[PDB]
Design a protein around this nucleic acid. Structure first.
Ligand SMILES: [K+]
Ligand SMILES: [Mg+2]
Ligand SMILES: [Mg+2]
Ligand SMILES: [Mg+2]
Ligand SMILES: [Mg+2]
Ligand SMILES: [Mg+2]
Ligand SMILES: [Mg+2]
Ligand SMILES: [Mg+2]
Ligand SMILES: [Mg+2]
Ligand SMILES: [Zn+2]
Lengths: 74, 98, 58, 84, 83, 73, 77, 86, 53
RNA sequence: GGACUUACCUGGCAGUGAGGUGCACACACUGCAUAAUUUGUGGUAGUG
RNA sequence: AGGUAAGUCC
């Protein structure tokens, strides 16, 4: 009943992701599932301070992803 | 489901033993219940019926809440309602204080 | 309807982009909760005396 | 059964210009490359319009359906077969 | 479903969760109450920050709109189908 | 030992537990039962508002959606 | 491709210490070791902590189950 | 007794009953139910809608997407035991 | 699970993303579409009824 | 246009219509799975 | 069962 999202196009691409709590994050998309949970790699926090921080190989819950933007050509 | 057979009265077993026993008992014994509701209002009343979502039909409810300066108490009486289950936070059976 | 003669495809033209208007509500994570959700401890005194309760119908 | 008229209409606008307001109150205007049955949308050549009024240009975006308020589709689509 | 079909092709005023109003010609719906509105116009009430000044109604034209069901609150009929 | 959520709770059933709600209140008491949606029935329950004890309640149903985390004693 | 479920399983095995960003709560995070989990993404966290961003001090919890609805993002150390 | 299987099945019986609904956004609706639906979507006629801190407004018809409902306030006389045998 | 193509007046007894895309990038389909909106331009012919007055 | 052949993509479960019985597949309606991330059981709380 | 694609006949 529940189909997977079409994010083959964005695989292994650097993305910038708008997230739930006014949080933004950026990194390389290594994988996904039908809830749109994402695996990001070499991911950077992009805190409001303007300061960026490196956490890598994160899991993002699909639920809390609003929009993603490709930084590199798809 | 884990129970794809068409008589999941596993529904009822849960009702009798599981956590919604709070309701099943309240209904049976006609005990008063206090519900903290997501409008942030307090409903104290009796439970005539309920369902999986904690949809409840209530009787003799007193809705109680706080407004403002210093905080003022407020209450209203509602004699029959249907409450939508999603809007339940917590239900509390009457602890028989005496 | 993507791949048509440009004669017909000119029908599926956007309307002009919409005027900006600011948002109506603040963002949910940045809204100020003046009386946040609160507990039921103060209210127990409201409950009936159990002697004064009605009897179990079944 | 399961598929419904308004989502069809969304898919009919694939390939054209759509505006899309997200839950956050941002607005994305651009070419709708593709849409899924959930309203998740990939778009190209987007003029985003942030809450404040400032705009930006974005190459490629993808938007979760669950986070969309509404879309503006091309008026021609009202003459689609389904809407009759 | 005839409760909804009853109003089809009528002009309907929809209240959204943020308090916008969409008025529009009601072309289609589904199990979610996603809507298709034609010639849809959006209205909104803007509060005066000073305690008493006249409130602004702000129209803004959208055209053909697909409203996600989740953001719908209510619909009432605004007017009869256009000719 | 990979210790998953259903077994974890089943563990704590019987034992005193503290449940923290998304809304910032917490309820302490003897976890009695749980279902597949993780609704919780508590007994001898008491209400802790902002970390420190608010009052003693009783037998309480907590609708699952409201819970943030649950923890032993 | 790395399935998000697998990399959670990777985190479990590694006994890595995971930090969770929360849904719609931006002041608190929670960190701990993932002993177990499920289909809903509920986590069992062995030595959980409450981290408050304004405070920059932590509240110790012990072993917790954190319901999945809350999770926004999973991080390491 | 105990819980019904589904309790919307009750609300669906309330045709021609006049009720007051409170919405999750503070709006109050008073009206006469023409139909209730499995998803608790609710149709009313002869409606007086009173948005939060606004003056009432009368309407010939109103439909409410059910998720928005916090509760129904029912007629004091409504025969519950009858209607609950389900 | 079923899908109805308004353009083709045909059914996909079991719908999927894959199947619907295959159908929609189909020879028969694309022609039916072209036809549908050409037929609509013929509508503009009905404008002449106004043209005559 | 129509018929067949091959390959590829797809396919939830149940009750009834449906009348010799059983199986398979389709259609119609009705349920269930379905209160667990993308709409139908709440971080849009009503908080002025 | 249906769609598509390639082929065979009408
Ligand atoms: K259902
Ligand atoms: Mg919702
Ligand atoms: Mg027969
Ligand atoms: Mg669901
Ligand atoms: Mg839900
Ligand atoms: Mg499920
Ligand atoms: Mg949800
Ligand atoms: Mg849901
Ligand atoms: Mg929901
Ligand atoms: Zn077709």
């Amino acid at each position: 009943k529940a189909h997977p999202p079409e994010l083959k196009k964005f695989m292994d691409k650097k993305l910038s992701l708008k997230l739930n709590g006014g949080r933004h994050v950026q990194g390389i998309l290594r994988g996904f599932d039908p809830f749109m949970n994402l695996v990001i790699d070499e991911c950077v926090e992009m805190a409001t301070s303007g300061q960026q921080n490196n956490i890598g190989m994160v899991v993002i819950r699909g639920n809390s992803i609003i929009m993603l933007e490709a930084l590199e050509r798809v | 489901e884990m129970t794809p057979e068409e008589l999941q009265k596993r529904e009822e077993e849960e009702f009798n033993t599981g956590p919604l026993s709070v309701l099943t008992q309240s209904v049976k014994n006609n005990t008063q219940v206090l519900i903290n509701c997501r409008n942030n209002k307090k409903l104290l009343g009796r439970v005539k019926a309920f369902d999986r979502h904690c949809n409840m039909v209530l009787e003799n409810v007193k809705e109680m809440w706080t407004e403002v300066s210093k905080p003022v108490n407020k209450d209203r009486y509602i004699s029959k309602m249907f409450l939508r289950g999603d809007s339940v936070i917590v239900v509390l059976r009457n602890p028989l204080i005496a | 309807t993507q791949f048509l003669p440009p004669n017909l495809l000119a029908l599926f033209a956007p309307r002009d982009p919409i005027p900006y208007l600011p948002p109506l509500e603040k963002l949910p994570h940045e809204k100020h909760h003046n009386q946040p959700y609160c507990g039921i401890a103060p209210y127990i005194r409201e409950f009936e005396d159990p002697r004064d309760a009605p009897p179990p119908t079944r | 059964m399961s598929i419904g008229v308004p989502i069809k209409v969304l898919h009919e606008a694939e390939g054209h210009i759509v505006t899309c307001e997200t839950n956050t109150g941002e607005v994305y205007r651009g070419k709708l490359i593709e849409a899924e049955d959930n309203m998740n949308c990939q778009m190209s050549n987007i003029t985003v319009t942030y809450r404040d009024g400032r705009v930006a240009q974005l190459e490629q975006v993808y938007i979760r359906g669950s986070k969309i308020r509404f879309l503006i589709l091309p008026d021609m689509l009202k003459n689609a077969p389904m809407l009759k | 479903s005839s409760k909804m079909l009853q109003h089809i092709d009528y002009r309907m005023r929809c209240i959204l969760q943020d308090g916008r109003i969409f008025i529009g010609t009601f072309k289609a719906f589904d199990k979610h109450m996603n809507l298709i509105l034609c010639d849809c116009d959006e209205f909104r009430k803007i509060k005066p920050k000073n305690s008493k000044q006249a409130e602004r109604e702000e129209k803004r034209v959208l055209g053909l709109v697909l409203l996600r069901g989740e953001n719908l609150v209510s619909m009432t009929v605004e007017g009869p189908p256009p000719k | 030992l990979p210790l998953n959520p259903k077994p974890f709770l089943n563990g704590l059933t019987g034992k005193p537990v503290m449940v923290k709600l998304k809304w910032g209140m917490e309820y302490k008491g003897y976890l009695v039962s749980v279902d597949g949606y993780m609704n919780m029935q508590l007994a001898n329950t008491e209400e802790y508002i902002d970390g420190a004890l608010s009052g003693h309640l009783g037998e309480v149903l907590i609708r699952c959606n409201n819970v943030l985390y649950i923890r032993g004693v | 491709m790395v399935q998000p479920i697998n990399l959670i399983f990777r985190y479990l095995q590694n006994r890595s210490r995971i930090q969770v960003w929360l849904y719609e709560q931006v002041n608190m995070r929670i960190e701990g070791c993932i002993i177990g989990f499920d289909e809903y993404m509920n986590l069992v966290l062995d030595d959980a902590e409450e981290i408050h961003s304004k405070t920059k001090s932590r509240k110790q919890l012990g072993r917790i189950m954190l319901k999945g609805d809350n999770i926004t993002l999973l991080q390491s150390v | 007794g105990s819980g019904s299987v589904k309790l919307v099945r009750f609300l669906m019986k309330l045709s021609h009953e006049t009720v007051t609904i409170e919405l999750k956004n503070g709006t109050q609706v008073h009206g006469t139910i023409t139909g209730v639906d499995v998803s608790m979507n609710t149709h009313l006629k002869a409606v007086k809608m009173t948005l939060k801190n606004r003056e009432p407004v009368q309407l010939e018809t109103l439909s409410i997407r059910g998720n928005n409902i916090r509760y129904f306030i029912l007629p004091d006389s409504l025969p519950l035991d009858t209607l609950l045998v389900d | 699970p079923k899908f109805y193509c308004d353009y083709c007046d045909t059914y996909l007894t079991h719908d999927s993303p894959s199947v619907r895309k295959t159908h929609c990038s189909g020879r028969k389909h694309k022609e039916n579409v072209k036809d549908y909106y050409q037929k609509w331009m013929e509508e503009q012919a009905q404008s002449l009824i106004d043209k005559t007055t």
